[PDB]
Write a protein that binds this DNA or RNA. Sequence first.
DNA 1: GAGTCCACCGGTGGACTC
DNA 2: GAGTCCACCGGTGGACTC
Lengths: 336, 334
Amino acid sequence: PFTYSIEATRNLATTERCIQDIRNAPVRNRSTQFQLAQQNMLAYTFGEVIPGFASAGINGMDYRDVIGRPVENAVTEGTHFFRDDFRVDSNAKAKVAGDIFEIVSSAVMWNCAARWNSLMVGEGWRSQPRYSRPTLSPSPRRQVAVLNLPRSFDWVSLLVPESQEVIEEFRAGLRKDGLGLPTSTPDLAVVVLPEEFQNDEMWREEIAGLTRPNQILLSGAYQRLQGRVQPGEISLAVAFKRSLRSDRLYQPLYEANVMQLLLEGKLGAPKVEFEVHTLAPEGTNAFVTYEAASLYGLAEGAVHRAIRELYVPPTAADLARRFFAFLNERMELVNG
Amino acid sequence: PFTYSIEATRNLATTERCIQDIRNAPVRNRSTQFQLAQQNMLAYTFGEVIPGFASAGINGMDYRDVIGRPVENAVTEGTHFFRDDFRVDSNAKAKVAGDIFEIVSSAVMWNCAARWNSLMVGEGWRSQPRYSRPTLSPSPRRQVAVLNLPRSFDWVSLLVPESQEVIEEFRAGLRKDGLGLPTSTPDLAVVVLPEEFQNDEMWREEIAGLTRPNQILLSGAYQRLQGRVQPGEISLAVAFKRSLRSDRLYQPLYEANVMQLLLEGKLGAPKVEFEVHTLAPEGTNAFVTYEAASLYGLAEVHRAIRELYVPPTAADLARRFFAFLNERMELVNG
DNA sequence: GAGTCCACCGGTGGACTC
DNA sequence: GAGTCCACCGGTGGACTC
Ligand SMILES: [Ca+2]
Ligand SMILES: [Ca+2]
Ligand SMILES: [Ca+2]
Ligand SMILES: [Ca+2]
């Protein structure tokens, strides 16, 4: 559970444990002795909890403490079963906390989209826990989908076939000239729900926890939307970074720039909204860094920021509020 | 020395040792038990050797093993003195290996520049170790300076003030609108030697090794050029990354684009040449990532980053730089 | 199981500032 | 001395394939 439980832990089958012992089962060019089983940790810690949609005590606690809870639980489990032999490299804890921050933050946003969507389809505004009611007039045409994008994704794949075609009658050209304009991915995208799915019920149901089945539902959702989104309909991109360092700032800034070149410059979409979320900005450098203007826009000839904001969520509840308020204002631009 | 030596290690003052024991003097908020004294390690391992300008055995040795030699010698010293107690985090070894990769390679380029400058001022071509003589016709106007840039630098501060004013007026315009266009830095910049300096012999002397003083001469040279470089005289920028991950590619790419926007768009420079050097590409993702066209170029076409280079040996890094000079300096009139 | 890729970030040694 | 900032990268869990 969210709060460690010796009983729930011993109730686990060996392959559901948060710490997997692989001493007598190594791995080429790795010295790992104990693996932190990310997906099991999530299931144990947030199996019945989605922060911001849970108890008062969890919805309002330091979001840093929430995100750090899975590792804390797993290290306790590791200590109990293995006492003195237990050992994991800080680089293991680093990788795992990053993924937890992204997966948990994306879950919060999934549930927001679901409450938002049911409102849009005339079902009223849920009230546990209680959040102020959006004042935008309901419309099925103003539903959205929250898409936690996978490793190796190319966001251009979300786009409707005619838009992807435009992008290629551009890059094929460059590439034949020994250049190119590759695209990777933000961590997450929020898109307007395609007309064809606007009466589909799955886009309105909140999840109760990050159980393995719900992990999959969430992590696989982008597949449903591939090839279906108009250029103007990518409404928000988010990059998560649990903590910042000065060198780790530029992938989001570079990708934001390429997205704006392609979407606004070549596809006539309005300003692309892209933001970065962190729990430890470790100073002020980052805030200034992210004030930079979009390059393509600049060099061509209104200019705006590449990155709209660096946001430091203090509690899961604030993350949810920020997203509800963003929707309440952004979707006004959708006819409905 | 480059090859570990029990005796040289024995003769080291406590403050010169490559492993500093700090179990009795903890850094606040840190668990560190032993520090890797990175400057000490460079003086121990490379105190009399600059790879590519030393023995043929070192020059033609795999560059990964040369770059890894310092940390290896330190771990040996650590084990000898503290046995089973010696413990450092991989993140420490990572930090120091990154800095050593960067420091040694720019030292190699520093000696290349020296040899190049000697030839440009009519002193002929040094021959040990052997390297092909450039075919470019010598001129004192074609000398260059090699600038290992410091942490927290802003490359804009290399430019003559008239040029700094154009940029600062531009970005002051932007800040008024709540925008910006900050500039950080590449690890290294090679620049045409300013006229005032074209007869100062310090730019033609090869260092024998990375002793502390030579470390400081090289790490401090950028200060001599601040405020003196014309926009078109920044000849090559280089970013060093010992290994690569798909996430750690974008700072050089981003900074290159900004350099081009500013130097080419705003200041009328020729193509800005910016390249990345690594010992471990880990696949072909990075080579494709770096074929990306300059965004400013499009907004108007050449790449942002000219090449991703994987030096196999120090000698090869030297050869490539000489060849670069032979071509790039044709744009400077003799 | 093994091989290969992808993208996560935290612990660092030294420079600067009082 | 002691406090802050900078920019270094290697060890990871899981996706995909057989
Ligand atoms: Ca993801
Ligand atoms: Ca991320
Ligand atoms: Ca440097
Ligand atoms: Ca570097």
